[PDB]
Symmetry: D2
Subunit: 426 residues, 4 copies
Amino acid sequence: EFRIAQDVVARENDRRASALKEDYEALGANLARRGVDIEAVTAKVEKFFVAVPSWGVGTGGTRFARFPGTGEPRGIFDKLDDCAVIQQLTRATPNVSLHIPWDKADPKELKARGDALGLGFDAMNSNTFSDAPGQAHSYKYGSLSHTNAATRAQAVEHNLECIEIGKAIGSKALTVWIGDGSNFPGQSNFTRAFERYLSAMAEIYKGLPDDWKLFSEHKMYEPAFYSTVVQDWGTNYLIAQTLGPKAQCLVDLGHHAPNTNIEMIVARLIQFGKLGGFHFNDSKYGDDDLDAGAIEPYRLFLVFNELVDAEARGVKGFHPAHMIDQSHNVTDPIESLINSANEIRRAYAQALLVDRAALSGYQEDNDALMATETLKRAYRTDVEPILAEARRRTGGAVDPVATYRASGYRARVAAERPASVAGGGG
Amino acid sequence: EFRIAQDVVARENDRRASALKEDYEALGANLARRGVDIEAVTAKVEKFFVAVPSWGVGTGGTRFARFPGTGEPRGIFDKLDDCAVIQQLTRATPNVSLHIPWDKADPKELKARGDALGLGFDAMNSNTFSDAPGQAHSYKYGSLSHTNAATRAQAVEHNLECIEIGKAIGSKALTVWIGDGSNFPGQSNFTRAFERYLSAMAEIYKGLPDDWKLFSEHKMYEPAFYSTVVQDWGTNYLIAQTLGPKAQCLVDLGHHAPNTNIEMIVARLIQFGKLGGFHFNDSKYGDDDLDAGAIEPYRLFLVFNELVDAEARGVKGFHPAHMIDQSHNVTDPIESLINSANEIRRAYAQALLVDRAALSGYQEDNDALMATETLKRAYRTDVEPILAEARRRTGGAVDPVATYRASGYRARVAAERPA
Amino acid sequence: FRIAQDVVARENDRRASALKEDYEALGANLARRGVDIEAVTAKVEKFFVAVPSWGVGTGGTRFARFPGTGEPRGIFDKLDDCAVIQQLTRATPNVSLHIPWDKADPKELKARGDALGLGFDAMNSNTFSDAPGQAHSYKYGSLSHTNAATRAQAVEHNLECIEIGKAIGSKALTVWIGDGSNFPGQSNFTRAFERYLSAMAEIYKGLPDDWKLFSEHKMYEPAFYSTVVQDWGTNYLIAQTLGPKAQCLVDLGHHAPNTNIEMIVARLIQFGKLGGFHFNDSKYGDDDLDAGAIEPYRLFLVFNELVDAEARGVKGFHPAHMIDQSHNVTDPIESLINSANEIRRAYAQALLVDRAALSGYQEDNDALMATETLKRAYRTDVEPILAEARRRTGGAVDPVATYRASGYRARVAAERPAS
Amino acid sequence: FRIAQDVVARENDRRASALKEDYEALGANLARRGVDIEAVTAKVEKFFVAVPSWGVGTGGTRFARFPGTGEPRGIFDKLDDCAVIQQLTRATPNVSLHIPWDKADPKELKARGDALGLGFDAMNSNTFSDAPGQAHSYKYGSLSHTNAATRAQAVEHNLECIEIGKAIGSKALTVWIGDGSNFPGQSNFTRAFERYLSAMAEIYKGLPDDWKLFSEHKMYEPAFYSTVVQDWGTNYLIAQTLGPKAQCLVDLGHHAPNTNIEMIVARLIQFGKLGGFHFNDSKYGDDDLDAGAIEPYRLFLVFNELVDAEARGVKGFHPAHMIDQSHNVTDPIESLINSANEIRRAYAQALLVDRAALSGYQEDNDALMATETLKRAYRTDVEPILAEARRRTGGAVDPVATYRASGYRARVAAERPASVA
Ligand SMILES: O=C[C@H](O)[C@H](O)[C@H](O)[C@H](O)CO
Ligand SMILES: O=C[C@H](O)[C@H](O)[C@H](O)[C@H](O)CO
Ligand SMILES: O=C[C@H](O)[C@H](O)[C@H](O)[C@H](O)CO
Ligand SMILES: O=C[C@H](O)[C@H](O)[C@H](O)[C@H](O)CO
Ligand SMILES: [Zn+2]
Ligand SMILES: [Zn+2]
Ligand SMILES: [Zn+2]
Ligand SMILES: [Zn+2]
Ligand SMILES: [Zn+2]
Ligand SMILES: [Zn+2]
Ligand SMILES: [Zn+2]
Ligand SMILES: [Zn+2]
């Protein structure tokens, strides 16, 4: 099944083929003079994948308003159809991350559709930061760390159910992010709340298959505006170390305090074997959830520099579960995810260009200037040709968004899906 | 009419009257030893009012969820009834701030309900940061600064409508806060978007009554996550200055960058005559919209210190509009607004205690330690007795929240209103 | 006696009447709240915080240093000044030394301390600056420097600090270093940390059985891109890796903007790694300002966590309390006096918190009453308690005013030549 | 010449081949994009940024200063090192002086500058530190100090800076002061600012007809509670109040965390008060790190605003750019060289933006394509352009490599005595 007509992809690829060959060959020659085999780089890029969030193909909003576009997906099945477009064009997003109960449906169907669309399933995502219809206990004052035992049990039960759904569709991990925290000093006893969280998470841990992982995700604030139980990587580390070997930490780019050195957190988690994976996006003020690399592309590169450094050396078990976690409020969700997945592969490719041996030498000699310049020589390289050729060689589009717009896909689904209404948030 | 039974108020006041007399008399003796007449302070405190936001009367939420409590107001009229409780108990919130179209309803009836409940109306608040039913042009990419002329005109017209509603109920000001901005570099041309905004605001100013003020509110980010047209007080000053004498700047405490010295911004605006008013609330991370003084009470005091100093310096024509702008996500909105109004009067009261003569002396002599200690001697003073007595003498409750709960008001409206 | 006893007596008597009135008034108010003021005063008078030897001299920035008169010429003058702080506040019996700044014959330091009635807190090592005759520079790091010989030199320096501390009565070594990078790529984050861990393991081996090793994290400065011990997470990994004797020190001004510092304190306590505190205040970065001068509520909330620990019955909880400030525009002695006072102030207020009520409100998720329970304690002016604690222990009712009446500064100015 | 010509020629020839390949390849790619590489290079070789005389010496923090070898002592040694940066990058023909640090006979300063092929940019006054024999201390402020005699002393000092500047070819005075408070209540915000404005009015009166007075805002440090000239808002009030010759200086690292600095640049340009931009980079505060070493995209976004205005020559838009950094762990000359390079890099990339296309995507509210239009320019590796520009103007293809090959540092190390060694 091809969401995007093959004729359109071929047409748009041929229209740009000539320019691509010129740019690829020019870059190839430049890299050659730099002792780098462009083909080796392209080969790895072609194999780099990042999961797409099911809740990301729909238009997002803020607490102030939501301005939906046309052809908004009705549910998981429409979302999968849309995710298929992203994968077909970029070839960098073969897997989709589901969120329950948003995407709750017959596991068999989900699996059937994914298979037909050529999509797999990444980490499951539980939802105890909002109340569902007919829910017995409200999560207003928390969930896994709520002071009421019944509420915690209900939360634990929900997460276990997410694991059951995941096993039936091919998932191998559960990502746990909660809003648990407080808005006022004194409202929560920091320690007791955390103790309650660890005990509940230990219950969820018991329901994990032997080849499954449990990812806890920290966030400094929002929805909690005074304190958050899992507020930073420090608390996250304590959680993972306490729960067990299958418990690891997820680092979401926009979940840190202003000016935080995020790439260091990545290196620390790697050093202690607790880097479960990433949640890519970009930001300038808070948890903005913007398109990856749209605000600080260098920071994205620096994070990948830590990832590649580890990938280059003795790769223990190092297999971080990478996923995109963004909100598209003023763009066509599909186009944003396409360029975001592209930016991630861009950062990765540039990180692969780093002369590791030279960098090591400058680090040992404390030649700070040359060390940073060694990183910049890689970062400054325009690897777009590598990314475009990788897509072309794997059945993708040279220029994904251009092909997407040429296909008229959005107008198509807009004519098949019911209209949406603009609204608020809170 | 009284939303809260008068016998409950009297009862809960008598129950605490003895202790209050003890604390008030003790504080009185302490202030007298400091050369301060406690009566002069109480008199000023009972005259300090801050407007309550109609949109803060119902439970608030985030982009992740909203967890409504019981007895949620069904509309503006229920909201006015709840606002009447806040005023009755604290006596510090006689006026309500309306937001259109959220509170759109027959102005004539709003006025009638207000008068009956003993409530007045503060500044009107326009809303072009969200789309309304049947709206011709979406504000997705902006409003007053939108690239499309027809959209900007529609936004201007909406603001003029807000003025018409306000004139009918006795409002004398229009506050304009928009989300206009960009989420990506390059999406907007900073200068052209600002030029469009200035031109639209000029049209609104043209339609502003000569007995009204026009307040522009700056905000660093949210809903825009890369750039915001009216992002800080600098741009806000340029706006007010450009528009005219009737245009001023509104300062919302949670709308500034991390570590910003907000009290300095307040002083700067006062010095150049553009401090239109305040939107009180507290915060720790961003525009958290938490109960005022719940996070950084000293900062709140420092802001009031600049307000009181303005009077001491002889600044004239200075009558800032005071308004609360908060979101109550995990508490009873009424109780939060009650304690927030209380906290604001608390900071004001402490600012009144500052020995201006001593402070001035320490500032001229560059005695930093004693200057800061002079501020602390005021801030460290527990003025709760003054706050409680002010309420008691004006028909309010010694302990507002305690009386509120003792009245069972929440359960009452929970029964009258759906779930 | 650094300050004449007749001066202390005279100033105490001059303020005795007002102290009596305020204390008794507060005593009655607390009694009505079910609190025994005598019990609070008894604990307050036993709360001690170490004074930094390096804080008695005027501090500066990279732009300039503006010394005052009578700057101490060395460690002995510094101890003399520290004795003034202790005599007047009775809250700072111990001094924290820094090597090599305070290097001197251990026997003489001990003798001077005993003579002045002062003890010694944790020793502090210095590998963030180069001393004369140093075989290796710390320009690119110390304990984590790529060069093995440089790390060895840093280790030996720390071992020397322990030897000095053992001779004077110290029972801990605090390690803060500037190690980090100013450019991406300059350092391999993991290898630099591994080098640090190896060096610290060596230092740990030289620890007596009753000693502790405190590592102090800092987000930035002097390193402006990355810092090896950048936050509490890395700090926890250090203490856990080193062993039972290794704990973490939390310096209030060393965290990222908006960080919830009190939570960090609670987390470290829960896992038994809260070695101690470095008290100070700040608004922008590691400003090192007088404790409580900027965010007094935050200071109170940190103490609320320390007191709750005691309430929860945490076993063997004896954090080391120390002031770590820089006094750039005030008399260092006066700032340390009022800073020690602010710390006792926040501690006293934390003791006033009705834990029983708080426990109930936290259980029932009554956020508003829970926060109001904390506020009822924080808003209480405990100055009378602090003042009476000093009176009873031979200190001054108003420390700074007594200091000024003594003419001490002028005295030492005439005795000490400016360099 | 500070650096031997044969060394420059040798290191250029060594890299000439690869440069031709890369330059011709980029010229071809740009041609396909409808851009003439030559037009970009012609402008790049004419883009200059002043080097701070105080930037060639090793910087330090309040904890320590770790000097390298051959540290320049005094303005003459400093000019000698600044000449190296200019000869190799050809992007820093002018030096910014600081008084009293660089105090010396004007005639001699002018002579040494002409001899080295260096001019002089804005003068920089210093009332944030006390000089020996000073009548009044600046401990509690300078231009806004409560003591009248102290303000008068600060004003006279600034006037003296103007006199020195007039004698050496300078056409502006930059005023950055530490004035502020470390404690609430210590200063009366309004009165302090009034005193400042009054003192600046006096300095303004001493300005020649063709001179400019630049005020520089800073959120904090050395003042840790409040700063008189804390941000661009206050800065704008200053410039607007003083007159046509007064403008604002924007120092990248002087803003609150997460501030949108490029917007501040746009606002000032719109109102004709952008006097100049002080380049450096940062991650935490006023770190004063090498430009573009931390956030190169932000630097590009700032230049996007500059180029936009430079193309439409806005009224009052003639910014005086300068590098204002502190080099604590690198060879200062090498950092200034690579920082000047980064500045021209961001300038070159901003010059590549398809303004027509961008304006089109902005009007249609196509946020994705608008941001991608900026990225297409930013992702372009313009090093071949910067290198050819240097090669054509007498500089080095690879500045730092040529500097190291010359052995300059070892040379001045042998000529200048270190404190110990
Ligand atoms: O802020 C929320 C985190 O990003 C979580 O990963 C969350 O579940 C996700 O964003 C979906 O809302
Ligand atoms: O963030 C928005 C500002 O606080 C405005 O005053 C706004 O109108 C108010 O918050 C209502 O949502
Ligand atoms: O910032 C440095 C830390 O506070 C250290 O404790 C340091 O040793 C202290 O400031 C004295 O320099
Ligand atoms: O921080 C100070 C500013 O950068 C000034 O421009 C200053 O004159 C220079 O950087 C050094 O004093
Ligand atoms: Zn996430
Ligand atoms: Zn998030
Ligand atoms: Zn507001
Ligand atoms: Zn707001
Ligand atoms: Zn410290
Ligand atoms: Zn510090
Ligand atoms: Zn500067
Ligand atoms: Zn600076």
